[PDB]
Each structure stands twice: as structure tokens, then as C-alpha cells.
Paper text:
Here, we introduce a family of designed Förster resonance energy transfer (FRET) pairs with near-quantitative FRET efficiencies based on the reversible interaction of fluorescent proteins with a fluorescently labeled HaloTag. We hypothesized that engineering a reversible interaction between a FP and fluorescently labeled SLP would enable the straightforward development of FRET biosensors with large dynamic ranges. By engineering an interaction interface between a FP and the rhodamine-labeled HaloTag, we developed FRET pairs (ChemoX) with near-quantitative FRET efficiency. In conclusion, ChemoX is a chemogenetic platform of FRET pairs that enables the development of biosensors with high dynamic ranges attributed to the reversible interaction of FPs with a fluorescently labeled HaloTag.
Because of its chemogenetic nature and involvement of eGFP, this design was named ChemoG1. As eGFP and SiR show only limited spectral overlap, this high FRET ratio suggested that the two chromophores are in very close proximity. The eGFP surface residues Y39, K41 and F223 form a salt bridge with the carboxylate of the fluorophore (K41) and π-stacking interactions with the fluorophore benzyl (Y39) and xanthene (F223) moieties. Their modification led to drastic loss in FRET. We hypothesized that the ChemoG1 conformation observed in the crystal structure exists only transiently in solution and identified interface mutations to stabilize it (that is, eGFP: A206K and T225R; HT7: E143R, E147R and L271E).
Residue numbers in the entry: 3 to 63, 67 to 229, 237 to 529
The structure:
């Protein structure tokens, strides 16, 4: 069943409803892509005007399209029931108002995933939030809690939807849900876990009928708390006539620890790692030029531009010796600086770092087509600059766990204006993949050669399946690099700091205590 979801799947939804005697029908069409947990659908009220608010129908109107992480695939009941499908039953209690009772069958009909529903609503107030149409046309993010019902060979599901009301209040809709397979075959019965959801509601400007356009992303989580705050005072330094922002905490003496982020992040990516190190060592975490809270001049934002500014940042702070903690393009900066200043580097901690990627075969299959499209002057700028895909989509797809709205808004803040998105597009176009661009390939080969000969203490973090660093490569490097300790962080893609910050931070702290600094 799970193999039926490896690509984009067309969806059809049909709803027959009756709420307080008002009969109506809704039809929907679109597609789902479980790789991304994604649904893109358009729903039409085929009987006229919808007698209830469109948001009240979102949960009723295909959880088999949820993004289940690799390490949780044995917990995905929904896909395991396919193609024969499952019955989905709910009662939805609208607080201080009526209730919906729904029964749906979700199954494949040919190549199409179909959700057919009957809905009955009763006991609603004619002047309440639902029949009075007092709900805002928007939708919140929720946790959907799933447990097995071993006796009934299905699952029990519970969650509370928060509907924003036009007077600023919130109307709760308490969801009680049961799913049972239609077929007679066995299914996966999961351990307790949850789905983290988000939904975006919009309108079709050319559609005359009452309708709803829906974009939804859902990732499963909860099988094996992470701070969202950024409690660091801003520090600024003039670098090459531009102001760069940096975190600066911990004791003033000793060897400083320099944390370098990559694409599309900022010093925010280090927020839950720095507190493990600050007790014993100075922590300096700059925002790269063009990113975070640093100034954003009109540059090409080639790697060489970042080299120039980071060189000058390090000198501006008068750093002499450093320990480097580096990630993604921050690792290219850190390694390239170490190669040129080996006497000044007392240790390198690194993770998901820039290495020569010899063939596209080594790039994750699920992200291969998108990064190839990023690496163009037309389509790639449309995606990254015009549509902000690297922030809105590639960033969440580089983290195994769900990124919360607060965390997303921290990552979004530097790039609300499309003109400032140049570094987000130039960075993937600098990645050394399949020999191009040759100048980056040559630079990265040089610092990898240096790394293989240098005695500097090394700490390598890696996760499964990773993105830049497959687990087999991390293992090979741990065995071949001198004075290298390797730490498996568990599940992870690219931003390993977001999937296991406590292990990364505590192991850096312990490793620092073993250095002769
Ligand atoms: Cl990149």
C-alpha cells in the first residue's frame, strides 16, 4: 500500500451533507504527494451556497497523504490499508453548539485516491458561530493524536480544532475519530504518535461558484521538547562597510567557539546548541552577510563573497585561535578558513557539510529534481526568489520533525522582501555536484585534502538518511579523517540541530573539555 504513494496521486472527494435540515453537496479534486505530506485541492459546493462555513468542513474533506518519517513507516496505518482502503468515522462537537457525524470511505478507484463522505449535523444554533457564519476564512495548525485499537484492527484518533471567530474568540471543535480497514488483509497498527498539520485556505479568482482552495502539509511525529526562543542580545560589527549581526555569550576569556550556519538559516539554527557550550566557552555566532539580521548589500552572494565577509568578520572581532562549529555552507566557510589558517584552529565540530558530490546519484532521490531546477537562471529564480521555496518548503524538508509556526517565522523574517532572497538562490547554484561549478569543486577538494592530512581534533555529527552526507559516507570519513570522533544523532536530514540539539550540544561540550585549550 505504501508503494502506491511514492509519487503524486490524483484525489477525488465527494461529500453529501445535511446540517439542521439544510442539504448540500461538495465535490473536490486535486492531488496529494506524501513525500511532502502535501495536499492541494479545490472544493466546490455543487448545490449552491454552502450552508456552513468552509473551515468547518476541512477535517471531513485523506490522512494517507501524511509525511511519515523513515523511522516511523511501520506506524502508518493509513497507507497500509490501501488500495482497498478504510472507513473513517467521526463525531465533531462544536463547543456550545451542534455536532457533525461523518462516515467516509477512503480507497483507490483505479489510480485515483477517492474520499466519499456522508455528513449529518444536528442541534446547531441558527445564530451561533456555524449557522451564523461567524468563522474567519483561515485555519490553524494542530496535533492529531493516533493510537491503535487492536481489538477492532484499526485506530482511534483524537484532536481539537481551533476555528478563529470574527470577534477574536476561538471556537473549539472536539474531534473523535475511528478508522477501520475495508479490506480483509492485515494492516499496520501503530504505537501512539501524532500528526502535525497546517492548512492554507484561499479562493480561485476565476471561480464563480462557492468554493475553497486548500493547501495542506502534514508530518507524523512522536516516536524515537525543543526551544523556539532566541534569547540572545544582538551584537553588531562593521565589516567591509556593512553591519553584521552576531550572538556573543559565554566567558570573555579562553578559546572562543565560532558557530557558522548555512542556507537558508541564521544564528537561530544554533539557539539550542549554544546554551550547552556558553557555560564553559565564549560562543560567537554571526549571521552571514545577506542573511539573518546582518546587512544585505547588493551582491551576487557567491561563496567568494561570503569568504570575504567572514574573513573580515573574524579579524574585526580580533579572534586569534578558535574552535569551529560548522554546518552546510558555514562548513565550507569554516573548512576553507581552517585550510588557510591551520595554526589558528584548535578543533572542528561539523555536520551535514559541503563535500564534492560526484554524481546526482548521491543526492537524495526525493530532492533531486527540485535542486536540479534550483540550479537554473529562470525556473530556479522563480522558485527561490519569486515563490520563496527554499524557506517555505526546502527548509521543512531538511528537518525530520515538524517545524513549528514560531520557528518558521524566525526563519522567514530575514527574507520577507523578495529582493533579499539572492543568497538563497546563489547557494544551491554553488553546490559542488557532478563537477560543477568547477571553481567550488576545486576549492572544496582542496580543503577536504587538507582535512584528511590535518591532526586538528574533529567531531562529526551525522544522521539517517541525511542529505549532504549519507550515513555510509559519514562512517567512511570517521574512519579516514585523523583525530575524528563521530556521533550518530539518529533520524535527520540536513538541519541536524533541529532534530537532536541536546545530543549535539552536550557532545560538543564534552568534546571541548577534552581539548588542550
Ligand atoms: Cl544550498
Amino acid at each position: 500500500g505504501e508503494e502506491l504513494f511514492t509519487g503524486v496521486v490524483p484525489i477525488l472527494v465527494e461529500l453529501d451533507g445535511d446540517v439542521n435540515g439544510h442539504k448540500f453537496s461538495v465535490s473536490g479534486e486535486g492531488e496529494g504527494d506524501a513525500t511532502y505530506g502535501k495536499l492541494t485541492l479545490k472544493f466546490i459546493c455543487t448545490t449552491g451556497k454552502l450552508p456552513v462555513p468552509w473551515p468547518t468542513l476541512v477535517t471531513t474533506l485523506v490522512q494517507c497523504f501524511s509525511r511519515y518519517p523513515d523511522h516511523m513507516k511501520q506506524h502508518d496505518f493509513f497507507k497500509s490499508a490501501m488500495p482497498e482502503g478504510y472507513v473513517q468515522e467521526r463525531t465533531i462537537f462544536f463547543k456550545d453548539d451542534g455536532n457533525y457525524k461523518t462516515r467516509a470511505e477512503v480507497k483507490f478507484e483505479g489510480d485515483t485516491l477517492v474520499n466519499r463522505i456522508e455528513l449529518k449535523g444536528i442541534d446547531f444554533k441558527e445564530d451561533g458561530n456555524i449557522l451564523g457564519h461567524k468563522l474567519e476564512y483561515n485555519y490553524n495548525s494542530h496535533n492529531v493524536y493516533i493510537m491503535a485499537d487492536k481489538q477492532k484492527n484499526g485506530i482511534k484518533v483524537n484532536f481539537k480544532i481551533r476555528h478563529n471567530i470574527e470577534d477574536g474568540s476561538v471556537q473549539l471543535a472536539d474531534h473523535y475519530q475511528q478508522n477501520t480497514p475495508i479490506g480483509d488483509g492485515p494492516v499496520l497498527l501503530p504505537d501512539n504518535h501524532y500528526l502535525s498539520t497546517q492548512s492554507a485556505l484561499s479562493k480561485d479568482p476565476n471561480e464563480k461558484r462557492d468554493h475553497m482552495v486548500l493547501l495542506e502539509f502534514v508530518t507524523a511525529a512522536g516516536i524515537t521538547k525543543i526551544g523556539t526562543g532566541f534569547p540572545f542580545d544582538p551584537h553588531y560589527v562593521e565589516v567591509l562597510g556593512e553591519r553584521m549581526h552576531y550572538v556573543d555569550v559565554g566567558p570573555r576569556d579562553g578559546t572562543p567557539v565560532l558557530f557558522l550556519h548555512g542556507n537558508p538559516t541564521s544564528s537561530y539554527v544554533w539557539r539550542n546548541i549554544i546554551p550547552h557550550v556558553a557555560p564553559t566557552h565564549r560562543c560567537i555566532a554571526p549571521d552571514l552577510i545577506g542573511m539573518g539580521k546582518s546587512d544585505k548589500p547588493d551582491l551576487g552572494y557567491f561563496f567568494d563573497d561570503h569568504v570575504r565577509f567572514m574573513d573580515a568578520f573574524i579579524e574585526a572581532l580580533g579572534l586569534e585561535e578558535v574552535v569551529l562549529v560548522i554546518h552546510d555552507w558555514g562548513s565550507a566557510l569554516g573548512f576553507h578558513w581552517a585550510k588557510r589558517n591551520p595554526e589558528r584552529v584548535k578543533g572542528i565540530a561539523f555536520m551535514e557539510f559541503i563535500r564534492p558530490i560526484p554524481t546526482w546519484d548521491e543526492w537524495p532521490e526525493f530532492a533531486r529534481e527540485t535542486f536540479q531546477a534550483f540550479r537554473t537562471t529562470d525556473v530556479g529564480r522563480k522558485l527561490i526568489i519569486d515563490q520563496n521555496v527554499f524557506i517555505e518548503g526546502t527548509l521543512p524538508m531538511g528537518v525530520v520533525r515538524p517545524l513549528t509556526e514560531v520557528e518558521m517565522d524566525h526563519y522567514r523574517e530575514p527574507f520577507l522582501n523578495p529582493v533579499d532572497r539572492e543568497p538563497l538562490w546563489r547557494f544551491p547554484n554553488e553546490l559542488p555536484i557532478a563537477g560543477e561549478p568547477a571553481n567550488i569543486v576545486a576549492l572544496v577538494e582542496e580543503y577536504m585534502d587538507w582535512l584528511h592530512q590535518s591532526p586538528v581534533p574533529k567531531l562529526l555529527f551525522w544522521g539517517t538518511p541525511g542529505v549532504l552526507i549519507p550515513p555510509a559516507e559519514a562512517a567512511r570519513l570517521a574512519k579516514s579523517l585523523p583525530n575524528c570522533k563521530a556521533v550518530d544523532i539518529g533520524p535527520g536530514l540536513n538541519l541536524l540541530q533541529e532534530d537532536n540539539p541536546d545530543l549535539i550540544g552536550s557532545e560538543i561540550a564534552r568534546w571541548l573539555s577534552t581539548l588542550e585549550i
